[PDB]
Design a protein around this ligand. Structure first.
Ligand SMILES: C[C@H]1CCN(CCOc2ccc([C@@H]3c4ccc(O)cc4CC[C@@H]3c3ccccc3)cc2)C1
Ligand SMILES: C[C@H]1CCN(CCOc2ccc([C@@H]3c4ccc(O)cc4CC[C@@H]3c3ccccc3)cc2)C1
Lengths: 235, 232
């Protein structure tokens, strides 16, 4: 799977995109963290399906797949949200039936809303494309946990870096395909990758909130993630 | 005007701007135990030199003093950390906080382990000094740029300048790799590998800031006014 062309990498990633879920609230009746949590919990299931279709990810051990998802899942929900929200200045499209502005985020929620809104606006300014977005989301999946991991290990990390390298090649191909000069290409690569630092930052701040709730299962456990990932072949 | 430096001149400027390597102040003839005290004293002295360094990052002092403070308030711990990871590079398994304070993980350990992993990543990539100073400057310019939370005309001008300087550092990084003979493909791949490590350095800073805030001591986190005073 390290033998896909750049164009096939793109097709594969676009094909793998999760569905856009709806919030579950009675639209005929007049809670917020409740809605957001229910949404995130349903997305996680589809996120696992998506991860398994990221070329190269299922070549890893089960344990390493879990570790990467444990590190990246909130960043992945967040970049998804920021992407969806790109065409709604000043609002966050949590779901097509749950479009919130910052005053609807108002304890310690408006702080993270604002960061998400800033990132969406940055995406809008850069005119981020769908093909670029799916590359970036895959990069988060592969990179966020890689510094936190034996001979098999070295083989695992080497493979992860090879896949990351091929996504870089793909991003560059997309930019060359759109007519950017070599200078513009490396400049845009750099701009896009630096935004991943801010997405990390946001995830840390959000994780900080979810832990402060002290509810038994508000961070996906290793064993929960393993259960979702450790699929069987009887379907 | 420093948007008109050559890449070589950018590198020369950054290398010359490098802060000194400070020493820990413990009495070496006395015994050992303390640790957070030593680490804090070191960081507090480094911060002053950090401000001097920042003012020499081409393009930084063209910003308003308010924006200079905002960038440094965002980035200061990331900058201390990338500095640490860099001078620790040739000490596998240890962190060279200062030449007289080289610590292993047994001597927080959550944070030590992340820093040690980054040092090893730098070692694995054979990070060069010229690359290091570009990355450190990128942290300074990038870390706070999405939290300005103001869109006055001046702020728009500020963000544009920050991104033009960041673009120039990118050009400089690519120029360094071209000069070492890397192919175009290798150049782009290495640029990406280096920038993705910045995400981990952000992560570490957040984990570290969580620690310093949990201490509940009056000024462990540098206040806006303190940075303002140092940058005046
Ligand atoms: C992995 C699941 C198992 C237990 N679940 C706990 C609920 O965690 C979350 C995660 C994200 C969110 C909010 C959200 C919901 C859907 C989405 O597509 C993106 C986001 C972005 C973050 C957002 C949030 C996170 C933390 C505090 C406030 C808001 C809220 C609660 C997470
Ligand atoms: C801005 C200064 C004013 C008040 N100071 C509070 C002390 O903050 C720190 C910052 C970093 C450190 C440790 C350190 C010291 C020197 C250095 O060159 C790099 C580092 C990397 C982080 C390290 C640390 C940070 C947080 C918890 C444990 C260890 C310890 C205390 C910070």
């Amino acid at each position: 799977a390290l033998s896909l062309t750049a164009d096939q990498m793109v097709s594969a990633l676009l094909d793998a995109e999760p569905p856009i879920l709806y919030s579950e609230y009675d639209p005929t009746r007049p809670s917020m963290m409740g809605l957001l949590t229910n949404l995130a919990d349903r997305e996680l299931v589809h996120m696992i399906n998506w991860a398994k279709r990221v070329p190269g990810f299922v070549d890893l051990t089960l344990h390493d797949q879990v570790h990467l998802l444990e590190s990246a899942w909130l960043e992945i929900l967040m970049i998804g949200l920021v992407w969806r929200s790109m065409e709604h200045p000043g609002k966050l499209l949590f779901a097509p039936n749950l479009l919130l502005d910052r005053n609807q985020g108002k304890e310690g929620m408006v702080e993270i809303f604002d960061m998400l809104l800033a990132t969406s606006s940055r995406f809008r300014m850069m005119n981020l494309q769908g093909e670029e977005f799916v590359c970036l989301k895959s990069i988060i999946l592969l990179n966020s946990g890689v510094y936190t991991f034996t001979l098999k290990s070295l083989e695992e990390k080497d493979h992860i870096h090879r896949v990351l390298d091929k996504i870089t090649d793909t991003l560059i191909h997309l930019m060359a395909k759109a007519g950017l000069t070599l200078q513009q290409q490396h400049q845009r690569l750099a701009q896009l990758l630096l935004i991943l630092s801010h997405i990390r930052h946001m995830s840390n701040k959000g994780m900080e909130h979810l832990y402060s709730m002290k509810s038994k299962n508000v961070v996906p456990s290793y064993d929960l993630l393993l259960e979702m990932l450790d699929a069987h072949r009887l379907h």
